[PDB]
């Protein structure tokens, strides 16, 4: 039942500002120290900032000195991180975390480890503009060159920021689907492919449509992938 | 006449003393310590933000004339005052007995 | 600052096997204040161990921790499919609290050769001025495979990018995409497009001739 | 009723409070801070001897019945008491204005 | 006129104790912080311990923790270093030093640098026993093989601890004398040579005697160096 | 702890020349709190500079200091014979106060070949069971010279020790003693004792035959 839910994440240009919020529920929020912990895409965990029960003490990692400010509202069960003068290396998923404590006699003992984590919020710091993807077909041949199995797909190119969702035939096709993790191109835009292996005899009898959703630009692309017949 | 302590300037959690003046107070001039930095000054002289300067609080007995502007004999009161600052971290540390009793 | 070095970077074992994960600190950790976290893809970390050897609430008996000073271990006596994740150690005996860089625990299965497919750029993309050539390596094991691009037999360098899926929950394989990016003008100046996949002592080259069936 | 400060245990210059009891005193029970270590506890939890835990002194007003065993109305006195400890080094450090005012 | 004079140094076995004293004169001793600084033979300077004006603050280097104690007596203008559980690596010349200070307004500002040094006291920590030297002649040939110049000397062997003094003809011969710095042998005992180049025609007409003094063992050796005639 | 690295280890210059001594700190020194000391053999150090650039009392104008952060310099505009000594930098901006390992400033003069002498052990020492063979290199420059011992043409290793005097105040040369230690039994088993001194492209071997004139 205990939960931490972060919000406030998004795309911001270098030098910009962003305020993160974390809603705590199911426990006495004022009894705990809280922290912000971040994780750059495909990298490790990194401590950002700590705050004690009443916010009389605030601690920060060396890299965010004078730029980030941690705060809390015990009546609103909320934790905040004010992020100013944002840098490209601040790009990460930010986690709201709760610290374990003990009560020995009438003394409160804080331990700097986290018994509860939120789901995180993605913060992208970049000068690249929000753009919906350009969806291109990865067309199978009408006449197979791989026995009874044919591969087909969609190349989801030049979109920004993350994330995109890819489904096939409005979710009716899930088996043998591989949606690849996005790669950041040298242009600062993402690109990914979503593939599926199907029986080559089905190419004439079955329609294959990839449904690409890109919530940051509010763009949805439905692309029918047709066999490349000669 | 011994030189008043310079701990406020040599502490890793330095502080400044602010003067508080009131005619309805004994002593009338009270010195309150305000921490200089959020962090603490490390051995190298730099501010570390994984440590905090916190003010040490003490309950001092002050004389209050009731009704006002009448000094002779009455009943005093208690007031919390910041004496200096100390350096804290989020960790409760444990250290061996030979380092203790000093 | 205490630096935590985790070993090995990747651990390949099968369900039923014993897992030993190491965390080495650059300096002694006070009062053995070392925690372990498990993190599965797309999810937040979850506390397993605290105080080097104590299990967190709801953590099964197969997970155990040991160590003091600078050397710490996380043991999983008998691996279950659900235990394959990334594991992070974290110290809280020294300010600031720091984490290790993680150990990824992956399922060891039998070697499987991939089904290789090559896709020319779509004619639709070609009108934008860019040609993306895609090579798919479908359901193979292990994760390590050498993908090379050849354009009219000339080996390509610096114009491709790869992406690998998470280990398949059903057959324990990986799939890999390699994308070759060229301008339309460069793509039209050449004929043979080849994707060469090497896995051990075997190379499989899947190719096409531009503007040919 | 707020939890009394744990700074004495989380400070890099920790201290213990010693009870002082006398019938010729107001308050009769006085808490004096005695520094735990000669050195200070570094970020890693170890005692550093190139730093010193020093007690912060404060002048407190205490009531003294003259002649003894007669409490009503008289004249009070001043006494120096150790409130807590701070960490010092032999160096007077200088740090930039943006790290100040906190 | 200002001076610092150390005493108390000597040979002590490993695990032993020694108390060093430093007498201050020509200045107000109580106005200054003082330190002990050491220098291992042929090595650099190393901080040991500091003490403030009234001895309310005492600082120590990591390697002497719990073993050494610094103290002062402002009425006796004296500085002390109590050295217990002595180790072989504690072998060094120990210097007593005075720290510079300033008075800005009515505020005292200590600076951790040394405007006055004593001459130092040698502390030798070793299990080797005090022993006087064995003095052997470095005899010149009666018939020279180096033209008009002949070299002669004394080999001052197997003595402990340092120092020794070497003179020639009770100090009447100083020109062309080379008394080599002592080398610690693998036995833990010192050995040195003292040489002199003289005209080879003087070998028959002049007596050459090396006077070796070893105050630690209260031994003096006078060795006549005679030509090795065939 | 701030580590101070001094450069060069040894500086060879003549009186009248300008000397530049470097001190590099591993981390920035607060408020440029860097001092310099001069130490002559057998004497205590003496303060020259404080606060990176200020001269101590009685220090002549030819001595000057500069620098901030991590890089500091000591300059002697025109060297005088009295300035040839060891120089130490010391920081007092970080606790604990630390010193550099020193720069020895030695007088550069013309190359001088040494007068080499060899001495057999005395018959008096031989009755104690040990034979010390002494080789003297008298008044040479520079300090660097290769001394090798040969016993019946067999090159010796690990059974000799060298000692070098301080630079001569009058002619600016060095003298060197090399002592070969053998047991009486080893000394009596061999005939030819040779001390080989190499200085550049020249080797001088001074020898004797045991029990011969």
Short mmCIF file of N, CA and C in Angstrom, two decimals, chain A residues 47-125:
data_model
loop_
_atom_site.label_atom_id
_atom_site.label_comp_id
_atom_site.label_asym_id
_atom_site.label_seq_id
_atom_site.Cartn_x
_atom_site.Cartn_y
_atom_site.Cartn_z
N UNK A 47 23.49 9.29 -5.92
CA UNK A 47 22.83 10.14 -4.92
C UNK A 47 22.79 11.60 -5.39
N UNK A 48 21.66 12.31 -5.15
CA UNK A 48 21.51 13.71 -5.56
C UNK A 48 21.39 14.64 -4.34
N UNK A 49 20.39 14.39 -3.50
CA UNK A 49 20.08 15.27 -2.37
C UNK A 49 19.32 14.53 -1.29
N UNK A 50 19.52 14.94 -0.03
CA UNK A 50 18.83 14.39 1.13
C UNK A 50 18.18 15.52 1.89
N UNK A 51 17.11 15.20 2.63
CA UNK A 51 16.40 16.14 3.48
C UNK A 51 15.91 15.41 4.72
N UNK A 52 16.07 16.02 5.92
CA UNK A 52 15.59 15.38 7.14
C UNK A 52 14.09 15.64 7.31
N UNK A 53 13.49 15.07 8.38
CA UNK A 53 12.05 15.07 8.68
C UNK A 53 11.36 16.42 8.56
N UNK A 54 11.89 17.46 9.22
CA UNK A 54 11.31 18.80 9.22
C UNK A 54 11.99 19.77 8.24
N UNK A 55 12.90 19.26 7.41
CA UNK A 55 13.62 20.08 6.44
C UNK A 55 14.61 21.07 7.02
N UNK A 56 15.01 20.88 8.29
CA UNK A 56 16.02 21.73 8.93
C UNK A 56 17.45 21.43 8.40
N UNK A 57 17.66 20.25 7.78
CA UNK A 57 18.94 19.81 7.19
C UNK A 57 18.73 19.40 5.75
N UNK A 58 19.57 19.91 4.84
CA UNK A 58 19.52 19.62 3.39
C UNK A 58 20.95 19.31 2.93
N UNK A 59 21.13 18.15 2.26
CA UNK A 59 22.42 17.65 1.78
C UNK A 59 22.36 17.49 0.27
N UNK A 60 23.49 17.73 -0.43
CA UNK A 60 23.55 17.71 -1.89
C UNK A 60 24.85 17.10 -2.40
N UNK A 61 24.79 16.45 -3.58
CA UNK A 61 25.96 15.88 -4.25
C UNK A 61 26.77 17.07 -4.83
N UNK A 62 28.09 16.90 -4.94
CA UNK A 62 29.01 17.92 -5.43
C UNK A 62 28.64 18.59 -6.74
N UNK A 63 28.15 17.81 -7.71
CA UNK A 63 27.79 18.29 -9.05
C UNK A 63 26.55 19.20 -9.16
N UNK A 64 25.70 19.29 -8.11
CA UNK A 64 24.45 20.08 -8.17
C UNK A 64 24.46 21.31 -7.24
N UNK A 65 25.64 21.60 -6.63
CA UNK A 65 25.91 22.72 -5.71
C UNK A 65 25.38 24.02 -6.28
N UNK A 66 24.54 24.71 -5.51
CA UNK A 66 23.97 26.00 -5.91
C UNK A 66 22.94 25.98 -7.02
N UNK A 67 22.74 24.82 -7.70
CA UNK A 67 21.80 24.70 -8.81
C UNK A 67 20.49 24.04 -8.38
N UNK A 68 20.58 22.96 -7.58
CA UNK A 68 19.40 22.21 -7.12
C UNK A 68 19.04 22.55 -5.68
N UNK A 69 17.73 22.51 -5.37
CA UNK A 69 17.24 22.77 -4.03
C UNK A 69 16.20 21.72 -3.68
N UNK A 70 16.40 21.03 -2.55
CA UNK A 70 15.48 20.02 -2.05
C UNK A 70 14.58 20.69 -1.02
N UNK A 71 13.29 20.33 -0.98
CA UNK A 71 12.32 20.87 -0.01
C UNK A 71 11.18 19.86 0.18
N UNK A 72 10.39 20.02 1.24
CA UNK A 72 9.27 19.14 1.55
C UNK A 72 8.10 19.90 2.19
N UNK A 73 6.89 19.36 2.04
CA UNK A 73 5.67 19.91 2.63
C UNK A 73 5.02 18.74 3.36
N UNK A 74 5.24 18.66 4.67
CA UNK A 74 4.75 17.55 5.49
C UNK A 74 3.22 17.49 5.59
N UNK A 75 2.53 18.64 5.48
CA UNK A 75 1.07 18.70 5.48
C UNK A 75 0.49 18.18 4.15
N UNK A 76 1.23 18.34 3.04
CA UNK A 76 0.82 17.89 1.70
C UNK A 76 1.49 16.57 1.29
N UNK A 77 2.19 15.90 2.24
CA UNK A 77 2.93 14.64 2.03
C UNK A 77 3.76 14.67 0.73
N UNK A 78 4.40 15.83 0.46
CA UNK A 78 5.15 16.04 -0.77
C UNK A 78 6.62 16.35 -0.60
N UNK A 79 7.42 15.90 -1.57
CA UNK A 79 8.86 16.13 -1.65
C UNK A 79 9.08 16.85 -2.98
N UNK A 80 10.02 17.80 -2.99
CA UNK A 80 10.32 18.59 -4.17
C UNK A 80 11.82 18.69 -4.44
N UNK A 81 12.15 18.88 -5.72
CA UNK A 81 13.50 19.16 -6.19
C UNK A 81 13.40 20.26 -7.24
N UNK A 82 13.88 21.45 -6.87
CA UNK A 82 13.93 22.60 -7.76
C UNK A 82 15.27 22.50 -8.48
N UNK A 83 15.20 22.31 -9.81
CA UNK A 83 16.41 22.14 -10.64
C UNK A 83 16.60 23.36 -11.55
N UNK A 84 17.62 24.16 -11.26
CA UNK A 84 17.93 25.35 -12.05
C UNK A 84 19.25 25.12 -12.78
N UNK A 85 19.55 25.96 -13.80
CA UNK A 85 20.78 25.92 -14.62
C UNK A 85 21.11 24.50 -15.02
N UNK A 86 20.11 23.81 -15.60
CA UNK A 86 20.22 22.40 -15.98
C UNK A 86 21.25 22.18 -17.07
N UNK A 87 22.03 21.10 -16.92
CA UNK A 87 23.12 20.69 -17.82
C UNK A 87 22.74 19.38 -18.49
N UNK A 88 23.31 19.10 -19.67
CA UNK A 88 23.08 17.88 -20.43
C UNK A 88 23.33 16.61 -19.60
N UNK A 89 24.36 16.63 -18.70
CA UNK A 89 24.72 15.49 -17.84
C UNK A 89 23.74 15.30 -16.66
N UNK A 90 22.71 16.17 -16.56
CA UNK A 90 21.65 16.05 -15.55
C UNK A 90 20.53 15.16 -16.09
N UNK A 91 20.60 14.79 -17.40
CA UNK A 91 19.66 13.90 -18.08
C UNK A 91 19.72 12.54 -17.36
N UNK A 92 18.57 12.11 -16.81
CA UNK A 92 18.46 10.89 -16.01
C UNK A 92 17.02 10.67 -15.61
N UNK A 93 16.75 9.49 -15.06
CA UNK A 93 15.48 9.17 -14.43
C UNK A 93 15.75 9.58 -12.96
N UNK A 94 14.85 10.38 -12.38
CA UNK A 94 14.99 10.81 -11.00
C UNK A 94 14.02 10.04 -10.12
N UNK A 95 14.55 9.42 -9.08
CA UNK A 95 13.80 8.64 -8.12
C UNK A 95 13.68 9.35 -6.81
N UNK A 96 12.48 9.30 -6.26
CA UNK A 96 12.15 9.79 -4.94
C UNK A 96 12.30 8.54 -4.06
N UNK A 97 13.01 8.65 -2.93
CA UNK A 97 13.27 7.51 -2.03
C UNK A 97 13.05 7.87 -0.57
N UNK A 98 12.66 6.88 0.24
CA UNK A 98 12.41 7.02 1.67
C UNK A 98 13.53 6.30 2.42
N UNK A 99 14.05 6.92 3.49
CA UNK A 99 15.17 6.36 4.25
C UNK A 99 14.70 5.57 5.46
N UNK A 100 15.34 4.43 5.71
CA UNK A 100 15.00 3.62 6.88
C UNK A 100 15.43 4.33 8.17
N UNK A 101 14.62 4.18 9.22
CA UNK A 101 14.96 4.70 10.54
C UNK A 101 14.56 3.71 11.61
N UNK A 102 15.14 3.88 12.80
CA UNK A 102 14.85 3.07 14.00
C UNK A 102 14.60 4.01 15.16
N UNK A 103 13.90 3.51 16.18
CA UNK A 103 13.67 4.23 17.42
C UNK A 103 14.18 3.34 18.56
N UNK A 104 15.38 3.66 19.08
CA UNK A 104 16.03 2.96 20.20
C UNK A 104 15.80 3.82 21.42
N UNK A 105 15.01 3.30 22.38
CA UNK A 105 14.54 3.98 23.59
C UNK A 105 13.58 5.08 23.10
N UNK A 106 13.98 6.36 23.21
CA UNK A 106 13.20 7.49 22.71
C UNK A 106 14.02 8.26 21.67
N UNK A 107 15.14 7.65 21.21
CA UNK A 107 16.07 8.21 20.23
C UNK A 107 15.83 7.70 18.81
N UNK A 108 15.74 8.64 17.87
CA UNK A 108 15.53 8.38 16.45
C UNK A 108 16.90 8.18 15.77
N UNK A 109 17.08 7.04 15.08
CA UNK A 109 18.32 6.71 14.36
C UNK A 109 18.04 6.58 12.86
N UNK A 110 18.50 7.56 12.09
CA UNK A 110 18.39 7.59 10.65
C UNK A 110 19.50 6.72 10.07
N UNK A 111 19.17 5.93 9.02
CA UNK A 111 20.15 5.15 8.27
C UNK A 111 20.00 5.58 6.83
N UNK A 112 21.14 5.91 6.20
CA UNK A 112 21.18 6.40 4.83
C UNK A 112 21.03 5.30 3.73
N UNK A 113 19.94 4.52 3.80
CA UNK A 113 19.57 3.51 2.79
C UNK A 113 18.06 3.56 2.59
N UNK A 114 17.59 3.05 1.44
CA UNK A 114 16.25 3.30 0.97
C UNK A 114 15.37 2.08 0.90
N UNK A 115 14.39 2.04 1.82
CA UNK A 115 13.42 0.96 1.96
C UNK A 115 12.19 1.13 1.03
N UNK A 116 12.07 2.30 0.38
CA UNK A 116 10.97 2.57 -0.55
C UNK A 116 11.42 3.53 -1.65
N UNK A 117 11.11 3.18 -2.90
CA UNK A 117 11.46 3.95 -4.10
C UNK A 117 10.22 4.25 -4.91
N UNK A 118 10.20 5.41 -5.56
CA UNK A 118 9.14 5.73 -6.51
C UNK A 118 9.44 5.03 -7.83
N UNK A 119 8.65 5.28 -8.87
CA UNK A 119 8.87 4.67 -10.18
C UNK A 119 9.82 5.51 -11.05
N UNK A 120 10.11 6.73 -10.61
CA UNK A 120 11.00 7.65 -11.31
C UNK A 120 10.31 8.51 -12.35
N UNK A 121 10.96 9.64 -12.68
CA UNK A 121 10.51 10.58 -13.70
C UNK A 121 11.72 10.93 -14.60
N UNK A 122 11.56 10.81 -15.92
CA UNK A 122 12.62 11.09 -16.89
C UNK A 122 12.83 12.58 -17.09
N UNK A 123 14.08 13.03 -16.91
CA UNK A 123 14.46 14.42 -17.12
C UNK A 123 15.44 14.43 -18.29
N UNK A 124 15.07 15.07 -19.39
CA UNK A 124 15.94 15.16 -20.56
C UNK A 124 16.39 16.60 -20.70
N UNK A 125 17.71 16.81 -20.68
CA UNK A 125 18.27 18.15 -20.85
C UNK A 125 18.98 18.14 -22.21
#
